[PDB]
Amino acid sequence: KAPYDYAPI
Amino acid sequence: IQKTPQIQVYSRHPPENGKPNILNCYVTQFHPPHIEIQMLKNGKKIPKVEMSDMSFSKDWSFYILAHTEFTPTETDTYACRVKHDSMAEPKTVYWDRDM
Amino acid sequence: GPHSMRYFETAVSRPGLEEPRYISVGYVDNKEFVRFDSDAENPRYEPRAPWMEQEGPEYWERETQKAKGQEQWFRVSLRNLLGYYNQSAGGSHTLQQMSGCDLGSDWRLLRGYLQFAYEGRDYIALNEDLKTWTAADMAAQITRRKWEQSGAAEHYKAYLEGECVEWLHRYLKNGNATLLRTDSPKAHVTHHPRSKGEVTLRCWALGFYPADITLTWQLNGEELTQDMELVETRPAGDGTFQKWASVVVPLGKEQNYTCRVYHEGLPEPLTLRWEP
Predict the structure, then answer these.
(1) Same domain, C220 and C264
(2) Domain of C175?
(3) Containing H/E element for C138?
(4) What pairs make up the disulfide bonds (chain B)?
(5) Helices (H), B1-99
(6) In terms of domains, do C18 and C113 share one?
């Protein structure tokens, strides 16, 4: 499963 | 900043003159990932050259594998020519059947 | 057998290119096994090993959706990074991410990785504890705070301890024949006369997987960091690897020289010397 990111950088 | 490409040129199977084979140009340790790779027979661009896809190593540096079918002869020279921003001029490294 | 999974994501902006190109590559035990690329005519995650065509289209739709979200996340992040670094427009830029998990041979979690890099340089990374962040650069501190503030670490921590592990187990079963073993290397020594009275003994090692390997020349028992020659390990292009090590040798006085070869698929290391 690809991860999914929280807030942008 | 630009990291500058390391290059190896070599054959898949050990070479015998007249025996068909694959010739690899392994290009590594470069950044940014935009790079141009030609393979040359007797100074002339080999036309249909396989290019493995964009990939990067655990140190963030990019690496590509270029390969093509070739039949080594006694007398033909084979080379790989790499263009990348890290270097002003293209870099050519000649195939050495021994190393 | 210890195991791992990784996802290596990249987004590249180029000076006049309209939108960044996003590319994600999944690895199970270092072998590429899925891939997404926004430049493709129809952008989707495609399988990349045989054993993954075992997966029902709902899987590919979910993943492909994640990708499209990731693509947008990289877009926004790239845009902010320009600002953080006071870079103007009309340059080339790169943002990269590695994410994944390592398992012991007991199949338990060992380490989670979550790391980012900007322009090829370390930008921010989740520490081994999966709670705190490391970020060297002054510009990166902005990010460290935003993410400390917002519990980003708990989110990534959950993925790294749950989904990363659960799904890696699943993938491991589904190609339990494809990966279970490792290709041992075949070795031999070649002879190349050069200067007057001196020869090159070049110990080859071929057709091995995975790539980690060590080659050592001994003068009867004494190793040499004294001007032994090698090359970076390189792929044959058939899914196996090659390396060689060579050294300068007196012509005739050449059976005193033993190449040793160490690799994981080996029962024990190989000892070889020149056989004319």
Answers:
(1) yes
(2) 1-181
(3) none
(4) 25-80
(5) none
(6) yes
CA–CA dist C274, C258 (Å, integer) = 8
Cα atoms in the Cβ-side hemisphere of radius 13 Å centred on B89: 3
Q: How far apart are the first and last CA of chain B?
A: 31
**Resolution of this deposited model, Å:** 2.7
Chain-chain contact of B24 with C237 (C-beta, under 8 angstroms): yes
Task: Determine whether the interchain pair B3/C96 forms a contact, defined as Cβ–Cβ distance below 8 Å.
Answer: no
Q: List all residues 6 or more positions away from C72 whose beta carbon is below 8 Å from its beta carbon.
A: none
Domains and CATH numbers, chain B: 1-99 (2.60.40.10)
- The enclosing domain of C245 has a CATH number of 2.60.40.10
- List C92's β-bridge partners, or say none: none
**Order of strands across the sheet that contains C109-118:** C46-47, C31-37, C21-28, C3-13, C93-103, C109-118, C121-126, C133-134
Residues 6+ apart with CB under 8 A from C254: C199, C201, C274
Tell me which method was used to determine the 3D structure.
X-ray
Q: Which residues of B touch C (CB under 8 A)?
A: 1, 3, 6, 8, 10, 12-14, 22, 24, 26, 28, 31-34, 53-56, 58, 60-61, 65, 67, 98-99
